[PDB]
Amino acid sequence: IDRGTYRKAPLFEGELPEGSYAQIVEIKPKQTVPKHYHEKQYELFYIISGQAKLGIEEREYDAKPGDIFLVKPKTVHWVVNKKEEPFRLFVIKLNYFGDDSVWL
Amino acid sequence: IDRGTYRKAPLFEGELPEGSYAQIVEIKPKQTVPKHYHEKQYELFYIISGQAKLGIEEREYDAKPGDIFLVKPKTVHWVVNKKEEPFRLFVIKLNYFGDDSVWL
Ligand SMILES: [Mg+2]
Ligand SMILES: [Mg+2]
C-alpha cells in the first residue's frame, strides 16, 4: 500500500489483540519522512534492509539491518533514506488505537 | 540469560506499555523446544538467523531468516533446531501479564 514517502504491508491484519498492530514499512529511495510524533502509540522497529538516518528526540542514529529501536509516545522522530535501496523495517505498534500522528 | 533449551535477552526492559514485552531469543544448537501453549499472550516472531522447524497447532513450517509468525493464545507450538547454528528470533509478546506457559 502506497503512503507517498513510504509503502506499508499490514501483517496478521485483524488477528492481533486490540491496541496492537504490525506491518512492514519501506521508506522509498532517497526519501525523508519528516518530523512527527504519536500522541499515544509506541513503535518498535526492526531494520530488515537498507540504511538510513533515524532521528528520535535529539539523537540521529545510523540505522542498519538488525538494529532495533523504540519510539515512545510524544517523541519526535524522522527518517532520512540517503540510499537508492528502500529502507525496510518490521514495525510493531503498541497502545495503538488509530492514527495519532502530529506532523511538524 | 540462560533458559536451558534457549537463551533470551530482554529489549527495552521496563520501557514498553503494560501488556507488552520484547526480547531476542536464541534456540540453542540442535535443541527442541517442546509443545506448549500460552493461556493469554500472543507472540509475534521475526526470524533473524538460523533455520528450524516451527510448529503452530497442526502445521510445521520451515522457518528461515525474514519469516514472521504469529502464535495466538491457547495454540500449541514448538521448535526443532536441526542445525549447529543458534535459531535467533525477535519476539514481541502481546496481552502479556507474566509466565502463562502450559508445557505438555
Ligand atoms: Mg512513527
Ligand atoms: Mg511461546
Residue numbers in the entry:
A (entry chain A), B (entry chain A): 9 to 112
Publication text:
X-ray crystallography was performed to obtain the structures of the proteins. Both present very similar features: their structure is dominated by β-sheet contributions with turns and disordered regions connecting them, forming a jelly-roll barrel structure, and both present a dimeric quaternary structure.
Interestingly, the catalytic metal ion coordinated by these four residues is found to be magnesium in Tba PMI and zinc in Tko PMI; however, the structure’s resolution does not allow for making a definitive assignment, as the Van der Waals radius of both ions is smaller than the resolution. Tba PMI crystals were obtained after two weeks from condition F7 of the Morpheus kit (Molecular Dimensions), containing a 0.12 M monosaccharides mix, 0.1 M buffer system 2 pH 7.5, 30% v/v precipitant mix 3. After model building using Coot and Refine from the Phenix package (Tba PMI) or REFMAC5 (Tko PMI), the final structures exhibited an R(%)/R(%)free of 0.18/0.20 at 1.7 Å (Tba PMI) and 0.23/0.29 at 2.2 Å (Tko PMI).
